[PDB]
Design an enzyme around this catalytic site. Structure first.
Site, PDB file in Angstrom:
ATOM      1  N   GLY A  13       0.791  -1.260   0.071  1.00  0.00           N
ATOM      2  CA  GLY A  13      -0.006  -0.015   0.154  1.00  0.00           C
ATOM      3  C   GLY A  13       0.776   1.125   0.176  1.00  0.00           C
ATOM      4  O   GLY A  13       1.980   1.105  -0.147  1.00  0.00           O
ATOM      5  N   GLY A  16       3.079   1.080   3.375  1.00  0.00           N
ATOM      6  CA  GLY A  16       3.901  -0.134   3.905  1.00  0.00           C
ATOM      7  C   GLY A  16       3.173  -1.341   3.327  1.00  0.00           C
ATOM      8  O   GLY A  16       2.197  -1.286   2.426  1.00  0.00           O
ATOM      9  N   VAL A  18       0.981  -4.696   3.508  1.00  0.00           N
ATOM     10  CA  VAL A  18      -0.512  -5.233   3.793  1.00  0.00           C
ATOM     11  C   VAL A  18      -0.477  -6.772   3.925  1.00  0.00           C
ATOM     12  O   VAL A  18      -0.490  -7.347   2.900  1.00  0.00           O
ATOM     13  CB  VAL A  18      -1.660  -4.550   3.154  1.00  0.00           C
ATOM     14  CG1 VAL A  18      -3.052  -4.655   3.720  1.00  0.00           C
ATOM     15  CG2 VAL A  18      -1.554  -2.831   2.653  1.00  0.00           C
ATOM     16  N   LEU A  83     -11.585  -8.063   3.463  1.00  0.00           N
ATOM     17  CA  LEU A  83     -12.314  -8.366   2.263  1.00  0.00           C
ATOM     18  C   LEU A  83     -11.880  -8.918   1.250  1.00  0.00           C
ATOM     19  O   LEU A  83     -10.420  -8.931   0.956  1.00  0.00           O
ATOM     20  CB  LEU A  83     -13.010  -6.815   1.711  1.00  0.00           C
ATOM     21  CG  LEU A  83     -13.973  -6.138   2.571  1.00  0.00           C
ATOM     22  CD1 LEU A  83     -13.229  -5.116   3.503  1.00  0.00           C
ATOM     23  CD2 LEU A  83     -15.088  -5.516   1.964  1.00  0.00           C
ATOM     24  N   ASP A 127      -7.135  10.539  -1.184  1.00  0.00           N
ATOM     25  CA  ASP A 127      -6.258   9.641  -2.128  1.00  0.00           C
ATOM     26  C   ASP A 127      -7.017   8.588  -2.516  1.00  0.00           C
ATOM     27  O   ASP A 127      -6.464   7.193  -2.465  1.00  0.00           O
ATOM     28  CB  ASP A 127      -4.789   9.175  -1.345  1.00  0.00           C
ATOM     29  CG  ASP A 127      -4.068   8.714  -2.651  1.00  0.00           C
ATOM     30  OD1 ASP A 127      -2.972   7.689  -2.216  1.00  0.00           O
ATOM     31  OD2 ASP A 127      -4.165   8.864  -3.926  1.00  0.00           O
TER      32      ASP A 127
HETATM   33  C1  LIG Z   1      -7.833  -2.306   4.591  1.00  0.00           C
HETATM   34  C2  LIG Z   1      -6.899  -3.406   4.587  1.00  0.00           C
HETATM   35  C3  LIG Z   1      -7.420  -4.530   3.616  1.00  0.00           C
HETATM   36  C4  LIG Z   1      -8.468  -5.405   3.709  1.00  0.00           C
HETATM   37  N1  LIG Z   1      -8.644  -6.197   2.718  1.00  0.00           N
HETATM   38  N2  LIG Z   1      -7.909  -5.590   1.891  1.00  0.00           N
HETATM   39  C5  LIG Z   1      -7.902  -6.174   0.376  1.00  0.00           C
HETATM   40  N3  LIG Z   1      -8.634  -7.285  -0.101  1.00  0.00           N
HETATM   41  C6  LIG Z   1      -8.738  -7.625  -1.357  1.00  0.00           C
HETATM   42  C7  LIG Z   1      -7.595  -8.655  -1.708  1.00  0.00           C
HETATM   43  C8  LIG Z   1      -7.421  -9.701  -0.707  1.00  0.00           C
HETATM   44  C9  LIG Z   1      -6.390 -10.764  -0.838  1.00  0.00           C
HETATM   45  C10 LIG Z   1      -5.518 -10.620  -2.101  1.00  0.00           C
HETATM   46  N4  LIG Z   1      -5.735  -9.459  -3.098  1.00  0.00           N
HETATM   47  O1  LIG Z   1      -5.049  -9.473  -3.925  1.00  0.00           O
HETATM   48  C11 LIG Z   1      -6.697  -8.211  -2.747  1.00  0.00           C
HETATM   49  C12 LIG Z   1      -6.821  -5.527  -0.597  1.00  0.00           C
HETATM   50  C13 LIG Z   1      -6.062  -4.342   0.094  1.00  0.00           C
HETATM   51  N5  LIG Z   1      -5.059  -3.839  -0.666  1.00  0.00           N
HETATM   52  C14 LIG Z   1      -5.299  -3.805  -2.243  1.00  0.00           C
HETATM   53  C15 LIG Z   1      -3.827  -4.163  -2.711  1.00  0.00           C
HETATM   54  C16 LIG Z   1      -2.616  -3.080  -2.240  1.00  0.00           C
HETATM   55  C17 LIG Z   1      -2.699  -3.450  -0.723  1.00  0.00           C
HETATM   56  C18 LIG Z   1      -4.017  -2.863  -0.309  1.00  0.00           C
HETATM   57  C19 LIG Z   1      -4.470  -1.582  -0.202  1.00  0.00           C
HETATM   58  C20 LIG Z   1      -6.063  -1.163   0.384  1.00  0.00           C
HETATM   59  O2  LIG Z   1      -5.826  -1.376   1.857  1.00  0.00           O
HETATM   60  N6  LIG Z   1      -6.215  -4.014   1.502  1.00  0.00           N
HETATM   61  C21 LIG Z   1      -7.301  -4.585   2.263  1.00  0.00           C
END
Ligand SMILES: CCc1cnn2c(NCc3ccc[n+](O)c3)cc(N3CCCC[C@H]3CCO)nc12
Length: 298
Positions: A13, A16, A18, A83, A127
């Site tokens: 992200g 950092g 995730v 999610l 953003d």
């Molecule tokens: C808020 C934290 C969170 C919770 N779920 N999730 C998902 N879930 C979808 C998903 C799950 C398993 C594999 N893939 O590829 C997508 C993606 C995502 N992000 C997108 C990609 C870059 C990191 C990041 C940014 C936005 O929080 N952040 C989160």
């Protein structure tokens, strides 16, 4: 932490890495964001700690739930609900056929409800982009990272040197306005709406001036007629080329007249003229809104 089995890296992200992780004491599966800082300096600014911690109360069905804000070592962890898919990946996987129009309408309606809620509490996102809009199997869409930009800023490059995208940035930000208003989020969402419909980004700039000039080539170079005050913004140049405004029927076909009317109001140059999230929810475009279930293949 040793509080978590770290089932996978979800992605990188802005701030950092995730992770998808399982909490051992609850069995709960969550998303963990690791956010650091050059240790030597400010550290975690204690000011980011207080205002980010405030976001634990900003709860709504279209806002990704912030479960905890853990400040330890010299690292900040944000624990969020998990999610199963993000909109960037869903749009890419839907390239061939397109996201169906009733799902696009449902997603926009739900996204405007999340913005209206956050805005009513004076929290901006700043953003918005497809990667931070998350979806589930039951037809919901939620916004992630509301409030973080105010806390950390928006960097040019991410922790891993990836370029932060300019495609959804409002023109007042590109022209150097110091003070963001809620209108910046409405602009970003308008750009995402157009991309869902046409399956191509609306303004895919690759530098700040390319981004600005792409906006000017489509919507016309702004002047004092359409945007009182524009010629006085910090980064405005009298030497900007003067492009004529294009017609919307060319920019987002096959969107119908209600949709094109709404998008035009979400992309007004003057942030004071740009539609609010509350007012957008009442637009005739949403008269027939429904809540379809998407095809998710997990
Ligand atoms: C808020 C934290 C969170 C919770 N779920 N999730 C998902 N879930 C979808 C998903 C799950 C398993 C594999 N893939 O590829 C997508 C993606 C995502 N992000 C997108 C990609 C870059 C990191 C990041 C940014 C936005 O929080 N952040 C989160």
């Amino acid at each position: 932490m040793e509080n978590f089995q770290k089932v996978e890296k979800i992605g990188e992200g802005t701030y950092g890495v995730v992770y998808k992780a399982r909490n051992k004491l609850t069995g709960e599966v969550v998303a963990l964001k690791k956010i650091r800082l050059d240790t030597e300096t400010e550290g975690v600014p204690s000011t980011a700690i207080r205002e980010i911690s405030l976001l634990k109360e900003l709860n709504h069905p279209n806002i990704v739930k912030l479960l905890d804000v853990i400040h330890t070592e010299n690292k900040l962890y944000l624990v969020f609900e998990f999610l199963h898919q993000d909109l960037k990946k869903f749009m890419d996987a839907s390239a061939l056929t397109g996201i169906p129009l009733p799902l696009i309408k449902s997603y926009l309606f739900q996204l405007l409800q999340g913005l209206a809620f956050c805005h009513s509490h004076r929290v901006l996102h700043r953003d918005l982009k497809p990667q931070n809009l998350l979806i589930n199997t039951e037809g919901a869409i939620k916004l992630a990272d509301f409030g973080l930009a105010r806390a950390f800023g928006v960097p040019v490059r991410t922790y891993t040197h990836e370029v932060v995208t300019l495609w959804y940035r409002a023109p007042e930000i590109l022209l150097g306005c110091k003070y963001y208003s809620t209108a910046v989020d409405i602009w970003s969402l308008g750009c995402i709406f157009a991309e869902m419909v046409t399956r191509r980004a609306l303004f895919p700039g690759d530098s700040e001036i390319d981004q600005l000039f792409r906006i000017f080539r489509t919507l016309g170079t702004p002047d004092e007629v359409v945007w009182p005050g524009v010629t006085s913004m910090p980064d405005y140049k009298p030497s900007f080329p003067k492009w004529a405004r294009q017609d919307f029927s060319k920019v987002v076909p096959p969107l119908d007249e209600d949709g094109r009317s709404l998008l035009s109001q979400m992309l007004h140059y003057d942030p004071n003229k740009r539609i609010s999230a509350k007012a957008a929810l009442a637009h005739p475009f949403f008269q027939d809104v429904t809540k379809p279930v998407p095809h998710l293949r997990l």
